[PDB]
Design a protein around this motif. Structure first.
Motif, PDB file in Angstrom:
ATOM      1  N   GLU A 177     -42.788 -58.922 -21.476  1.00  0.00           N
ATOM      2  CA  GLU A 177     -43.840 -58.515 -23.284  1.00  0.00           C
ATOM      3  C   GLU A 177     -44.603 -58.705 -23.712  1.00  0.00           C
ATOM      4  O   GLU A 177     -46.148 -58.122 -23.988  1.00  0.00           O
ATOM      5  N   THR A 178     -45.032 -60.408 -23.219  1.00  0.00           N
ATOM      6  CA  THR A 178     -45.445 -61.282 -24.059  1.00  0.00           C
ATOM      7  C   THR A 178     -46.698 -62.017 -23.129  1.00  0.00           C
ATOM      8  O   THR A 178     -47.769 -62.367 -23.773  1.00  0.00           O
ATOM      9  N   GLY A 179     -45.919 -62.104 -21.920  1.00  0.00           N
ATOM     10  CA  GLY A 179     -47.042 -63.610 -21.322  1.00  0.00           C
ATOM     11  C   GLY A 179     -46.827 -65.047 -21.789  1.00  0.00           C
ATOM     12  O   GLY A 179     -47.239 -65.588 -21.243  1.00  0.00           O
ATOM     13  N   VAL A 180     -45.980 -65.360 -22.829  1.00  0.00           N
ATOM     14  CA  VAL A 180     -46.153 -66.499 -23.814  1.00  0.00           C
ATOM     15  C   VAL A 180     -45.102 -67.429 -22.898  1.00  0.00           C
ATOM     16  O   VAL A 180     -44.732 -66.637 -21.460  1.00  0.00           O
ATOM     17  N   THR A 181     -45.206 -68.791 -22.506  1.00  0.00           N
ATOM     18  CA  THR A 181     -44.273 -69.400 -22.138  1.00  0.00           C
ATOM     19  C   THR A 181     -43.304 -70.488 -22.827  1.00  0.00           C
ATOM     20  O   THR A 181     -43.620 -70.399 -23.785  1.00  0.00           O
ATOM     21  N   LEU A 182     -41.685 -70.532 -22.348  1.00  0.00           N
ATOM     22  CA  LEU A 182     -40.990 -70.511 -23.204  1.00  0.00           C
ATOM     23  C   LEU A 182     -40.844 -72.304 -22.815  1.00  0.00           C
ATOM     24  O   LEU A 182     -40.952 -73.252 -21.541  1.00  0.00           O
TER      25      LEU A 182
ATOM     26  N   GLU B  63     -41.111 -62.099 -31.978  1.00  0.00           N
ATOM     27  CA  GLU B  63     -42.675 -61.557 -33.048  1.00  0.00           C
ATOM     28  C   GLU B  63     -43.828 -62.870 -32.930  1.00  0.00           C
ATOM     29  O   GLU B  63     -43.791 -62.481 -33.609  1.00  0.00           O
ATOM     30  N   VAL B  64     -42.954 -64.041 -32.745  1.00  0.00           N
ATOM     31  CA  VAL B  64     -43.983 -64.611 -33.151  1.00  0.00           C
ATOM     32  C   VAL B  64     -45.378 -64.843 -31.365  1.00  0.00           C
ATOM     33  O   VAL B  64     -46.419 -65.212 -31.910  1.00  0.00           O
ATOM     34  N   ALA B  65     -44.762 -65.177 -30.418  1.00  0.00           N
ATOM     35  CA  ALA B  65     -45.390 -64.226 -29.498  1.00  0.00           C
ATOM     36  C   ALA B  65     -47.240 -62.963 -30.380  1.00  0.00           C
ATOM     37  O   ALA B  65     -48.154 -63.028 -30.013  1.00  0.00           O
ATOM     38  N   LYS B  66     -45.847 -61.530 -30.302  1.00  0.00           N
ATOM     39  CA  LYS B  66     -45.959 -60.600 -30.904  1.00  0.00           C
ATOM     40  C   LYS B  66     -48.187 -61.278 -31.174  1.00  0.00           C
ATOM     41  O   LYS B  66     -48.831 -60.608 -31.823  1.00  0.00           O
ATOM     42  N   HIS B  67     -47.461 -61.237 -32.979  1.00  0.00           N
ATOM     43  CA  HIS B  67     -48.103 -61.847 -33.728  1.00  0.00           C
ATOM     44  C   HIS B  67     -49.414 -62.664 -33.827  1.00  0.00           C
ATOM     45  O   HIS B  67     -50.611 -62.265 -33.705  1.00  0.00           O
ATOM     46  N   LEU B  68     -48.973 -63.782 -32.847  1.00  0.00           N
ATOM     47  CA  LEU B  68     -50.488 -65.432 -32.526  1.00  0.00           C
ATOM     48  C   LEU B  68     -51.190 -64.147 -31.389  1.00  0.00           C
ATOM     49  O   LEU B  68     -51.829 -64.308 -31.642  1.00  0.00           O
ATOM     50  N   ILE B  69     -50.566 -63.582 -30.516  1.00  0.00           N
ATOM     51  CA  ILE B  69     -51.209 -62.358 -29.932  1.00  0.00           C
ATOM     52  C   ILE B  69     -51.835 -61.561 -30.413  1.00  0.00           C
ATOM     53  O   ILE B  69     -53.384 -61.675 -30.514  1.00  0.00           O
ATOM     54  N   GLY B  70     -51.396 -60.603 -31.644  1.00  0.00           N
ATOM     55  CA  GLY B  70     -52.141 -59.872 -32.612  1.00  0.00           C
ATOM     56  C   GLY B  70     -53.169 -59.993 -33.141  1.00  0.00           C
ATOM     57  O   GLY B  70     -53.693 -59.689 -34.004  1.00  0.00           O
ATOM     58  N   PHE B  71     -53.076 -62.077 -33.660  1.00  0.00           N
ATOM     59  CA  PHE B  71     -54.510 -62.106 -34.414  1.00  0.00           C
ATOM     60  C   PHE B  71     -55.213 -62.753 -33.375  1.00  0.00           C
ATOM     61  O   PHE B  71     -56.326 -62.773 -33.723  1.00  0.00           O
ATOM     62  N   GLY B  72     -55.218 -62.814 -32.500  1.00  0.00           N
ATOM     63  CA  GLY B  72     -56.408 -62.684 -31.274  1.00  0.00           C
ATOM     64  C   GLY B  72     -56.086 -63.583 -30.179  1.00  0.00           C
ATOM     65  O   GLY B  72     -56.900 -64.186 -29.546  1.00  0.00           O
TER      66      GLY B  72
ATOM     67  N   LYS C  31     -51.960 -69.594 -23.786  1.00  0.00           N
ATOM     68  CA  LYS C  31     -52.785 -70.382 -24.276  1.00  0.00           C
ATOM     69  C   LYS C  31     -51.153 -71.247 -25.306  1.00  0.00           C
ATOM     70  O   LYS C  31     -50.747 -72.148 -25.531  1.00  0.00           O
ATOM     71  N   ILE C  32     -49.939 -70.202 -25.063  1.00  0.00           N
ATOM     72  CA  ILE C  32     -48.996 -70.323 -26.112  1.00  0.00           C
ATOM     73  C   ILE C  32     -47.468 -70.554 -24.958  1.00  0.00           C
ATOM     74  O   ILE C  32     -46.898 -69.605 -24.685  1.00  0.00           O
ATOM     75  N   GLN C  33     -47.075 -71.583 -25.993  1.00  0.00           N
ATOM     76  CA  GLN C  33     -45.961 -72.311 -25.899  1.00  0.00           C
ATOM     77  C   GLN C  33     -44.826 -71.953 -26.870  1.00  0.00           C
ATOM     78  O   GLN C  33     -44.849 -72.154 -28.227  1.00  0.00           O
ATOM     79  N   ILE C  34     -43.374 -71.344 -26.835  1.00  0.00           N
ATOM     80  CA  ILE C  34     -42.725 -71.374 -28.008  1.00  0.00           C
ATOM     81  C   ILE C  34     -41.204 -71.911 -27.840  1.00  0.00           C
ATOM     82  O   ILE C  34     -40.838 -72.291 -26.554  1.00  0.00           O
ATOM     83  N   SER C  35     -40.818 -72.671 -27.558  1.00  0.00           N
ATOM     84  CA  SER C  35     -39.928 -74.405 -28.297  1.00  0.00           C
ATOM     85  C   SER C  35     -38.762 -73.736 -28.474  1.00  0.00           C
ATOM     86  O   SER C  35     -37.891 -73.053 -29.549  1.00  0.00           O
TER      87      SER C  35
END
Length: 353
Positions: free
Chosen positions: A230-235, A195-204, A209-213
């Protein structure tokens, strides 16, 4: 040539200078809300930190991203002493702006709760582009360093994204959009990562550029894969030598699963040594033998090879992936009208508009 840069406390560097990078760590944690939870969160020893940083470099490391948001432990002056002590050994330090999870801010009266989102984004942009406040946004007096932040933090709590955390994610997204800076989000026990990933992407924000730790605290290889795909972010995983949560073996086997599924480009590593006994030199100041940063190289990376992760995957994890996710994007304008419907609706439900 690509010619991308990352923003260290000593200036912008080519991302090729980042080298082996610990994407989420600590040296100085000078008071703040964490210290209320336990005295071990207080870390004030510049000499011990420099010695620890030198062991990291001795094993091949170059860059440490110290992820302390201004109001939770950050100390610009001392961290700059550490950076200056290692710069001629090839050490790099990136510091953070932004916020931790809502639990660390007074929900009635903190500036996160009370100051309009737009004014907060201006203050975060200022740390990225003018200089970090040496008083760490603790109060109405500001004294900016020449050192700038090179990343913005947000955080979410356990099993829930609080309305103030959604506000902080909007701050992170907007700052990142405006400055090109990267984002790292702390999740609590590795919950709400999708959800964190989805919302950040939803904001634009750009998922590159996104890591989730802290996903290591939710050791669910299927969920890791779901998030990446699903989101393309980095863990960004920590977890080595945190037996009170989970054994080293579990993280190694889950990483191995992701690597086998073709997702090695979406993984970074860190120690997140944010208590005093989580570093070797600090441990010594307390009369104890403990592990710290060297352990990544002496113990964890060999376990990774042992369970079947290749040296090439490890090279991506330690070098190529940080070089991608910590690189500045070109500056963009933020358009509130492009915020996704799912985000707008959630803001409305959380009384944020």
């Amino acid at each position: 040539l690509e010619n991308k840069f990352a923003r260290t406390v000593l200036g912008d560097i080519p991302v090729e200078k980042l080298g082996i990078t610990d994407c989420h760590d600590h040296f100085i944690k000078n008071g703040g809300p964490e210290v209320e939870e336990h005295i071990d969160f207080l870390m004030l020893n510049v000499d011990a930190s420099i010695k620890e940083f030198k062991e990291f470099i001795d094993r091949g490391g170059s860059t440490i991203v110290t992820m302390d948001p201004p109001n939770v432990g950050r100390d610009v002056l001392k961290t700059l002493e550490i950076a200056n002590a290692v710069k001629n050994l090839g050490g790099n330090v990136i510091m953070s702006t932004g916020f931790h999870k809502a639990k660390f801010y007074d929900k009635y009266s903190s500036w996160l709760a009370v100051v309009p989102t737009e004014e907060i984004v201006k203050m975060c942009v200022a740390e990225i582009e003018e200089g970090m406040d040496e008083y760490n946004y603790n109060g109405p007096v500001v004294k900016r360093s020449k050192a700038k932040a090179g990343i913005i933090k947000a955080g979410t709590g356990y099993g829930a994204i609080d309305r103030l955390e959604l506000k902080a994610l909007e701050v992170a997204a907007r700052t990142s959009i405006l400055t090109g800076c990267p984002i790292l989000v702390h999740t609590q026990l590795g919950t709400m990562a999708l959800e964190v990933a989805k919302h950040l992407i939803g904001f634009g924000a750009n998922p590159d550029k996104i890591q989730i730790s802290h996903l290591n605290k939710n050791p669910d290889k299927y969920y890791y894969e779901k998030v990446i795909k699903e989101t393309g972010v980095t863990l960004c995983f920590d977890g080595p030598d945190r037996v009170k949560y989970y054994p080293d073996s579990l993280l190694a086997e889950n990483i191995k699963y992701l690597v086998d599924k073709g997702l090695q480009k979406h993984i970074t590593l860190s120690l997140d040594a944010g208590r005093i006994l989580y570093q070797r030199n600090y441990g010594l100041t307390k009369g104890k033998q403990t592990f710290g940063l060297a352990y990544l190289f002496d113990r964890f990376l060999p376990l990774l090879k042992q369970v079947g992760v290749s040296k090439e995957a490890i090279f991506d994890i330690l070098v190529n992936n940080p070089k991608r996710v910590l690189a500045f994007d070109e500056k963009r304008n933020f358009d509130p009208l492009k915020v996704s419907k799912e985000v707008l609706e959630l803001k409305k439900e959380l009384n944020l508009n």
